[PDB]
Design a protein around this ligand. Structure first.
Ligand SMILES: *[C@@H]1O[C@H](CO)[C@@H](O[C@@H]2O[C@H](CO)[C@@H](O[C@@H]3O[C@H](CO[C@H]4O[C@H](CO)[C@@H](O)[C@H](O)[C@@H]4O)[C@@H](O)[C@H](O)[C@@H]3O)[C@H](O)[C@H]2NC(C)=O)[C@H](O)[C@H]1NC(C)=O
Ligand SMILES: *[C@@H]1O[C@H](CO)[C@@H](O[C@@H]2O[C@H](CO)[C@@H](O[C@@H]3O[C@H](CO[C@H]4O[C@H](CO)[C@@H](O)[C@H](O)[C@@H]4O)[C@@H](O)[C@H](O)[C@@H]3O)[C@H](O)[C@H]2NC(C)=O)[C@H](O)[C@H]1NC(C)=O
Ligand SMILES: *[C@@H]1O[C@H](CO)[C@@H](O[C@@H]2O[C@H](CO)[C@@H](O[C@@H]3O[C@H](CO)[C@@H](O)[C@H](O)[C@@H]3O)[C@H](O)[C@H]2NC(C)=O)[C@H](O)[C@H]1NC(C)=O
Ligand SMILES: *[C@@H]1O[C@H](CO)[C@@H](O[C@@H]2O[C@H](CO)[C@@H](O[C@@H]3O[C@H](CO)[C@@H](O)[C@H](O)[C@@H]3O)[C@H](O)[C@H]2NC(C)=O)[C@H](O)[C@H]1NC(C)=O
Ligand SMILES: *[C@@H]1O[C@H](CO)[C@@H](O[C@@H]2O[C@H](CO)[C@@H](O)[C@H](O)[C@H]2NC(C)=O)[C@H](O)[C@H]1NC(C)=O
Ligand SMILES: *[C@@H]1O[C@H](CO)[C@@H](O[C@@H]2O[C@H](CO)[C@@H](O)[C@H](O)[C@H]2NC(C)=O)[C@H](O)[C@H]1NC(C)=O
Ligand SMILES: *[C@@H]1O[C@H](CO)[C@@H](O[C@@H]2O[C@H](CO)[C@@H](O)[C@H](O)[C@H]2NC(C)=O)[C@H](O)[C@H]1NC(C)=O
Ligand SMILES: *[C@@H]1O[C@H](CO)[C@@H](O[C@@H]2O[C@H](CO)[C@@H](O)[C@H](O)[C@H]2NC(C)=O)[C@H](O)[C@H]1NC(C)=O
Ligand SMILES: *[C@@H]1O[C@H](CO)[C@@H](O)[C@H](O)[C@H]1NC(C)=O
Ligand SMILES: *[C@@H]1O[C@H](CO)[C@@H](O)[C@H](O)[C@H]1NC(C)=O
Ligand SMILES: [O-][O-]
Ligand SMILES: [O-][O-]
Ligand SMILES: [Cu+2]
Ligand SMILES: [Cu+2]
Ligand SMILES: [Cu+2]
Ligand SMILES: [Cu+2]
Ligand SMILES: [Cu+2]
Ligand SMILES: [Cu+2]
Ligand SMILES: [Cu+2]
Ligand SMILES: [Cu+2]
Ligand code: NA
Ligand code: NA
Ligand SMILES: [Zn+2]
Ligand SMILES: [Zn+2]
Ligand SMILES: [Zn+2]
Ligand SMILES: [Zn+2]
Ligand SMILES: [Zn+2]
Ligand SMILES: [Zn+2]
Ligand SMILES: [Zn+2]
Ligand SMILES: [Zn+2]
Ligand SMILES: [Zn+2]
Ligand SMILES: [Zn+2]
Ligand SMILES: [Zn+2]
Ligand SMILES: [Zn+2]
Ligand SMILES: [Zn+2]
Ligand SMILES: [Zn+2]
Ligand SMILES: [Zn+2]
Ligand SMILES: [Zn+2]
Lengths: 497, 497
């Protein structure tokens, strides 16, 4: 790997990760983008150098560092027109943030329109030299990150507004398509007798995936950067933008075993070795697995996850037991999603800049009705009741700036106010569900809250949770370079966006 | 009403059933098309006079008489390029068929592309002078037919390939839109103390509807033209192309009560009186209801329906207990649906004409792989396992030429080989379901089997069940007028289709 200090150069290039050549957005010459690493406490200084030349995939860009709280550096969070104006082609912009109090598996991606789907996405790991789970595994390194990515042969802006799944699923940036000539599968090497911490990261633009490894079980020790009690499972449904670490004990006979990541829809199954990669024990022949899958007997259920460290749920143990309860009503009108009867339209002036300029009340912030102003140091409860009025469910919603307690998970009618998992992306399930979260407002600034299906986000499925507006300016000093972004951006010709 | 002998003139016209004026396809100057009636045993002679002028809504046409078996008149069934070539504009074509052995609630619609969605659809009732349910009701007439229709402001060929619901729901051809000026609601008049046989018919192009009447229950006595044991319910989910008769006892206080037909998706609910009509007791003021709905305590479940007359299930009481078992595998690739890896593409030469010309084996019939050849006088079992690979579920599949036993309903894991309902359209449910039907091949000819969501049909979600190919010509003599259709049609300029 690279980091915690690194240049990240954005270019357009031809890639063929599934055998099919297409133009993409790449970072330091690759997609998925390079693994960034550091250790808990590190200061990351990631200098984003925009050399993009292709307007169809957007020459402007903005990067979000998914999972990091950005406390005191809200201007670095990334969402275009919420936390910054986009960077322009031929300019650079330094993200500079510290990670005092987190460690785990993260990722980073474009947060402008659907650009991450065209390739600007990769994994990001912060190691804990005092990891409480260290004794559970031997080996944890660049070679134990596993990324999943949906890959499309037609560019995000050129295909359907809402594609029906992708052409291939890439595991560690490789995967096969339905087509006559099989391309190369990714191979993840292990030595028999060792235990691995695999760090599974969904870089998906849209579908969720069901991930399993033939003949092996997986002990989950982390979810979305939060340490968990160990939970042994044999299958994991992982939604866009989620992470898990799981320990794999390579204690099976030296062989090749299929690693499977079956998307929820699109080109499903494993015919011809699609949606697959290869776990290869050292000394197994260099051929495809012939291992066989079985029906899971212990599939992951989110209600079975619990934080390793006690993490009290904000507020009091009843529906509405908090300072500010919010129920989000989803709708859709064929082209745009809505939350409480508003589709998000990104404003000219980034929300953070509006707030720094003196707009502190919801009524004064734009887009009107999509920006919620929350009091500081308070408990918040948000429910996302699923509905057929919001197709493409289950929508995985993501809240910037925090980890939330999932007091009610999809597929469950239990409320858990005791020891629920905390995470940052949560499936909001299917009609009948009423997935409910809590968090405390301990992080002054405007934070995005949106579906992480990037096609839905781009069609307006988002609101902004602006907490502690009166202390936002003091809490989040902006660097001059950040103040320069809007004047550069607003000067661009439309053909250079 | 009109029939059993009638002219049905097809024109284009401007209509505004929900307050919004648009060009449509109308029959005898109206949409929904006029109620056709006769009595069991009648010979229907429906002369379809095509005076359509608008190519965007198709100037050619073909009509199907939904629910009728057409035994010995397969050439009259209607599906374009399965049973006939379309009629041309400036020509007429006589459908002439008998109904010796059926009576109940039916409907008729264009069976060319998506034309019925642009307005060519209406109800069709065959009364039974010896109806076994006659003593259950007092009044059964033109005024007790209730039709449901999804209505779109943009024409079928001009809007989305797969629309997200309709703009309004019309009940008896009237209904409101979301818009500032409420248009007129339909009013269904009853006199207190009388009992009505209401004949509910879904003319839907796509969504299913949940139908209820405030303060009243509904005793189902017929499903898809099959008499049932009486089943009292307080809500009915009715899928596209299904019918029910239910008896309503007008025994509530003289008032206005809301009639509700809530589509599965689109503009849902009842704000502003959308998706509604008015049951008005004679002497109630001429105003909107203020009645209130309640959660159903006895919603219809299909497994609760049973034929009034014992109807033995074909074959023997186990999975695969039949002469020819068939499992249909659904898929979708973003624009086209597939069944067993074939999308239906309608052939130049109608399937029936191919068969009359001497093609009798599946291998010789086109489109290859979409035409199944079934032996005569045999038991057939077909399963339609639901899958996310076929979005837009639950798909209501329809089999021409017969009524089938629904041995396994959606939402149910029971197999009923004893007294299951027989019907002709069945919801194939949601992933997890494996809806299964049986029928006997007692009706020589090619019969269509397809999703009755018209957008899906048009995107290829259909196969042809060609039974008794060797006796099809003998069983189904064709009139000269029918033999003339293809030469007229094949001579048309493309701008006159
Ligand atoms: C800027 O970024 C754009 C988005 O990535 C690039 O868009 C590309 O634009 C080209 C030219 O219009 C499109 O070309 C189409 O490609 C297919 C070819 O597909 C292949 O078909 C067989 C099998 O499927 C394949 O093996 C052959 O090699 C073909 O390449 C054609 O069917 C179309 O007629 C047309 O050629 C690309 O599809 C499109 N790319 C994407 C990813 O959407 C644009 O080229 C970029 N600008 C520059 C300077 O690179
Ligand atoms: C043949 O059949 C076609 C399909 O029905 C007809 O297609 C029509 O084509 C016209 C002209 O291109 C389209 O016109 C568009 O209509 C809307 C107007 O909508 C209304 O907007 C407000 C509120 O929404 C409304 O109250 C006003 O009265 C407007 O009428 C415009 O927004 C577009 O710019 C354009 O005018 C029709 O939409 C389209 N109809 C349908 C049903 O899709 C075609 O006219 C027919 N040929 C003949 C000779 O009648
Ligand atoms: C999903 O969960 C949310 C949050 O629990 C539900 O919204 C809440 O619904 C409750 C129950 O109706 C409302 O409770 C209150 O009840 C009292 C007593 O009648 C009433 O006086 C209050 O005005 C209120 O109705 C509560 O207000 C509401 N909370 C919020 C923040 O809106 C929601 O209905 C659930 N949605 C689904 C589809 O399950
Ligand atoms: C939906 O239901 C259909 C029909 O029941 C299922 O297809 C049938 O699947 C069964 C069970 O696997 C097959 O049974 C047979 O088992 C014997 C014993 O192993 C085997 O030797 C036979 O070759 C056969 O596999 C049966 O063939 C098959 N029937 C047909 C017509 O294909 C289907 O799997 C169900 N789908 C879902 C998703 O539930
Ligand atoms: C991995 O697991 C599979 C199935 O769980 C193993 O195959 C089973 O092994 C038992 C014990 O030998 C056999 O008796 C069963 O017939 C097998 N079950 C099935 C469903 O095939 C398999 O050998 C293991 N290893 C590989 C490489 O697949
Ligand atoms: C769905 O809702 C969106 C947002 O209301 C509609 O988009 C707006 O439509 C009006 C009329 O064109 C414009 O004033 C805005 O510029 C639109 N915003 C957009 C397009 O992002 C959209 O047209 C609605 N779609 C349908 C099919 O009704
Ligand atoms: C129709 O039914 C509703 C509700 O089922 C009636 O309202 C209920 O009537 C009881 C008896 O008077 C009241 O005590 C309850 O408060 C009502 N329940 C609810 C949910 O409101 C209603 O009066 C009936 N008639 C009309 C025209 O709505
Ligand atoms: C989905 O499948 C359909 C049917 O296979 C594809 O349509 C065919 O595509 C090829 C290439 O254009 C043609 O030879 C046929 O004429 C097409 N039939 C049609 C368009 O009805 C369709 O292109 C596939 N769609 C996608 C997005 O892959
Ligand atoms: C915020 O408010 C609580 C009261 O609920 C108060 O006791 C405390 O001092 C504040 N907490 C923090 C962490 O600043
Ligand atoms: C068809 O076949 C059955 C045998 O299963 C035979 O007994 C009978 O004569 C035939 N039935 C009819 C109705 O023609
Ligand atoms: O992550 O947005
Ligand atoms: O009915 O097709
Ligand atoms: Cu993210
Ligand atoms: Cu994020
Ligand atoms: Cu979504
Ligand atoms: Cu985000
Ligand atoms: Cu029909
Ligand atoms: Cu039919
Ligand atoms: Cu369908
Ligand atoms: Cu049909
Ligand atoms: Na809606
Ligand atoms: Na598929
Ligand atoms: Zn190039
Ligand atoms: Zn510049
Ligand atoms: Zn537990
Ligand atoms: Zn507003
Ligand atoms: Zn926080
Ligand atoms: Zn406890
Ligand atoms: Zn503060
Ligand atoms: Zn442009
Ligand atoms: Zn006109
Ligand atoms: Zn002519
Ligand atoms: Zn029963
Ligand atoms: Zn074929
Ligand atoms: Zn029959
Ligand atoms: Zn019995
Ligand atoms: Zn025969
Ligand atoms: Zn044309």
């Amino acid at each position: 790997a690279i980091g915690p200090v690194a240049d990240l150069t954005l270019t357009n290039a031809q890639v063929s990760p599934d055998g099919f050549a297409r133009e993409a957005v790449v970072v330091n010459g690759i997609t998925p983008a390079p693994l960034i690493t550091g250790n808990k406490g590190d200061r990351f200084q990631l200098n984003v150098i925009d050399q993009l030349t292709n307007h169809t995939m957007l020459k402007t860009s903005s990067i979000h560092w998914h999972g990091f709280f950005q406390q005191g550096t809200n201007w670095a969070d990334g969402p275009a027109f919420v936390n910054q104006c986009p960077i322009a082609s031929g300019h650079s912009f330094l993200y500079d943030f510290q990670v005092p109090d987190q460690a785990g598996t993260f990722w980073y991606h474009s947060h402008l329109s659907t650009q991450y789907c065209d390739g600007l996405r990769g994994p990001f790991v912060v190691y804990d030299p005092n990891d409480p789970h260290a004794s559970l595994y031997d080996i944890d390194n660049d070679d134990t990150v596993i990324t999943l990515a949906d890959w499309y042969h037609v560019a995000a802006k050129l295909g359907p507004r809402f594609p029906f799944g992708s052409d291939s699923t890439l595991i560690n940036g490789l995967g096969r398509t339905t087509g006559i000539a099989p391309s190369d599968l990714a191979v993840i090497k292990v030595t028999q007798g060792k235990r691995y911490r695999f760090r599974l990261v969904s870089l998906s633009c849209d579908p969720n995936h069901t991930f399993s490894i033939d003949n092996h079980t997986m002990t989950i020790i982390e979810a979305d950067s939060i340490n968990t009690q160990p939970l042994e499972v044999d299958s994991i449904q992982i939604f866009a933008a989620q992470r898990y670490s799981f320990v794999l004990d390579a204690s099976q006979p030296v062989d090749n075993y299929w690693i499977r990541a079956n998307p929820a829809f699109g080109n499903t199954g494993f015919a011809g070795g699609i949606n697959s990669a290869i776990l290869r024990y050292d000394g197994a022949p260099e051929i495809e697995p012939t291992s066989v899958q079985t029906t899971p007997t212990k599939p992951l259920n989110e209600v079975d996850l619990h934080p390793l460290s006690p993490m009290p749920v904000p507020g009091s143990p009843e529906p509405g037991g908090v300072d500010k309860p919010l129920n989000l009503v989803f709708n859709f009108n064929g082209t745009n999603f809505f939350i409480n009867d508003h589709t998000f339209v990104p404003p000219s002036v980034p929300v953070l800049l509006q707030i720094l300029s003196g707009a502190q009340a919801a009524q004064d912030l734009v887009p009107e009705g999509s920006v919620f102003v929350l009091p500081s140091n308070s408990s918040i409860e948000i429910s996302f009741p699923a509905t057929a009025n919001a197709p493409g469910f289950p929508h995985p919603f993501h809240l910037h700036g925090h980890a939330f307690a999932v007091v009610r998970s999809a597929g469950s009618s239990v409320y858990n106010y005791d020891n629920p998992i905390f995470r940052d992306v949560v499936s909001t399930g299917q009609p009948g569900d009423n997935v409910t979260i809590r968090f405390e407002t301990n992080n002054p600034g405007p934070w995005f809250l949106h579906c992480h299906i990037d096609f839905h986000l781009d069609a307006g499925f988002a609101v902004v949770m602006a907490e502690d507006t009166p202390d936002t300016k003091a809490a989040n000093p902006v660097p001059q370079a950040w103040s320069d972004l809007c004047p550069i951006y607003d000067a661009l010709d439309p053909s250079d966006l």
